[PDB]
C-alpha cells in the first residue's frame with residue numbers, strides 16, 4: 001500500500017539482503033526502497049518522521065527531502081541538512097507539513113544528511129492528477145507500475161575508505177537484483193502486465209551515483225513525463241536515466257504472452273547481464289514462471305536524446321533567445337581536484353547554523369552568509385540563467401536545483417541551445433568535456449535553495465552551492481513552526497555544539 005498524504009514514517013535500522021548479501025541499513029517504513037508516499041495535486045502532505053535510528057555507523061541523526069517538490073512558503077520543510085534545517089535527533093520526530101500546489105508527477109524522497117540515503121533511506125513519492133491530460137494514454141497507473149532503479153553497496157556509506165574508488169555491488173530494480181561479484185541466484189523483481197493493456201510506468205532513479213541504460217526486451221516506451229513535467233509523447237527503446245531523474249512512459253503490453261528481460265545497465269560496476277545482474281523480469285499474465293530468454297539488440301534503434309523531449313504544455317523559455325539573455329546570467333566554474341569539488345573556487349562544507357536560520361536571524365546578504373562563498377543571492381521576480389560547463393572529473397554529473405524546475409536551454413553532447421521549446425526538468429546531466437548545459441528559471445520562490453550534483457559521493461565532497469533566492473522576503477514568505485525552531489537547539493545540545 002501507498003501511504004499519505006498524512007502519515008507517520010519511522011526511520012529505523014535493520015538488516016537487509018536485497019542481492020543475497022546481508023548488511024545493516026537505514027530504512028523508511030521498514031523496507032528498501034521505502035514505501036510510496038502519495039497524494040493528489042494540491043494536497044496537504046504531513047509526513048511525521050520518527051527518527052528511531054540507533055546505529056552510529058550510518059548516523060543516528062536524519063533529515064528528509066521531498067525531491068522535486070517546490071516547497072513554496074515552506075522552505076523550512078525542504079530537508080537539506082544545514083541548508084534548511086538542523087537534523088532530527090534520535091528518539092525525536094518532526095512533521096514535514098507542506099502543500100503541492102501546481103505540481104503532479106513522479107517524485108521521490110531521500111535522506112539529505114551526508115551520504116545516508118545510500119544506506120537505504122530512499123523511496124518513491126507520487127502526486128497524482130485527477131484531471132491528468134495524459135490519462136487516456138494508459139489503463140493502469142498504481143503502485144505496481146512504479147519502477148525504481150537503485151545502486152546498492154556492501155560497504156557502508158560512512159565506511160567507504162578515503163582514497164579508494166567507490167562503486168556499487170548490485171543494481172536493484174524494485175528493491176531486488178544480483179551482486180556483480182560472488183553472484184548468487186537471489187530473487188529478481190517481477191513486473192506483471194496483462195496482454196492488451198497499457199501501463200503508466202513511473203521510472204524513478206533513486207541512485208546515489210550511476211546512470212542507467214534502461215530498456216525492456218521486445219518493447220518500446222512512450223515518454224509522457226520528465227521529472228514531474230508532462231511531455232509530448234516520445235517513443236524510445238532505451239532511456240539513459242541519471243541519478244534522481246524520473247520518467248513516466250507508456251508500456252503497451254503488445255508482445256506475445258511471455259517473459260521479457262528488464263535491463264538497467266549502470267555506467268560503473270558490473271557490465272552486462274551474466275548471472276542475471278542488472279536485470280528484472282517483465283511477466284505477462286498467463287506466461288510460464290521462468291526466466292526470459294530474450295536478448296537486447298547490439299545497437300538500440302531509438303535511444304532517448306534529451307533535445308527530442310518537449311513539454312506538453314506551452315511552457316516556452318523565460319528571457320531572451322541568446323546566451324546571457326536573462327536578468328541574472330551566471331556561468332559556474334565547476335571543478336575537481338585532490339578529492340574535493342568546488343563551485344567558483346569554493347568547496348561546499350555544511351555550516352553549523354543552517355542557511356535558512358542564519359537568514360531568519362537577520363543576515364541579509366549573501367556575503368554575510370556561511371559558508372563564505374557558498375551562498376549566492378538571487379534577485380526576486382527575475383529570469384536566471386545558469387551555465388554549467390562540464391569537465392570536472394567523475395562525470396557525467398547530474399545537477400539538481402531545489403525549489404524549482406527549469407528549462408534545459410542546452411543539453412549534453414549538443415552545442416545548439418533551444419530558446420523555443422526545450423523540456424523543463426529538475427535534474428540534468430551536464431554532459432562531457434566542452435559541453436555547456438544551461439538552465440533557466442524565474443525567481444518566484446523566496447528561500448535558500450540547494451544546487452548540487454546528485455551523485456551523493458560528489459555532494460559529500462563539496463559539489464554544491466546555495467542560491468539564497470529573495471533574501472529580503474525569505475522570513476515573511478516562510479513562517480516557521482515551533483517544532484522547526486526547536487531542531488537546532490536540540491541537535492546542538494545532543495552533539496555538544498555551541499553557536
Ligand SMILES: *[C@@H]1O[C@H](CO)[C@@H](O[C@@H]2O[C@H](CO)[C@@H](O[C@@H]3O[C@H](CO)[C@@H](O)[C@H](O)[C@@H]3O)[C@H](O)[C@H]2NC(C)=O)[C@H](O)[C@H]1NC(C)=O
Pocket residue numbers: 305307308414415416417418419
Ligand atoms: C541539437 O539540439 C538542437 C536544439 O535543441 C536540435 O535542434 C532542433 O531540431 C529540431 C528537430 O529537427 C528542429 O525542429 C523541427 O523543426 C522543423 C522546422 O525546420 C519542424 O518542421 C518540426 O516540426 C520540428 O519541430 C528545431 O528547429 C531545432 N532547433 C534548433 C534551435 O536548432 C537538434 O536536433 C539537436 N541535434 C540532434 C542530433 O538531436
Ligand SMILES: *[C@@H]1O[C@H](CO)[C@@H](O[C@@H]2O[C@H](CO)[C@@H](O)[C@H](O)[C@H]2NC(C)=O)[C@H](O)[C@H]1NC(C)=O
Pocket residue numbers: 323324325330331387389434435436438
Ligand atoms: C557557456 O556559455 C556561457 C554563456 O551562457 C559562456 O560565458 C561567456 O564566457 C566568456 C568567456 O569564456 C565571457 O567573456 C562572457 O562574458 C560569458 N557570457 C556570455 C557571452 O553571455 C561560456 O564561455 C560558455 N562556456 C563554454 C565552456 O562553452
Ligand SMILES: [Cu+2]
Pocket residue numbers: 065066067068069400401402403
Ligand atoms: Cu531536490
Ligand SMILES: [Cu+2]
Pocket residue numbers: 065067110244400454
Ligand atoms: Cu535530491
Ligand SMILES: [Cu+2]
Pocket residue numbers: 394395396397398453454455458459463
Ligand atoms: Cu558529480
Ligand SMILES: [Cu+2]
Pocket residue numbers: 065080112400402450452
Ligand atoms: Cu538535493
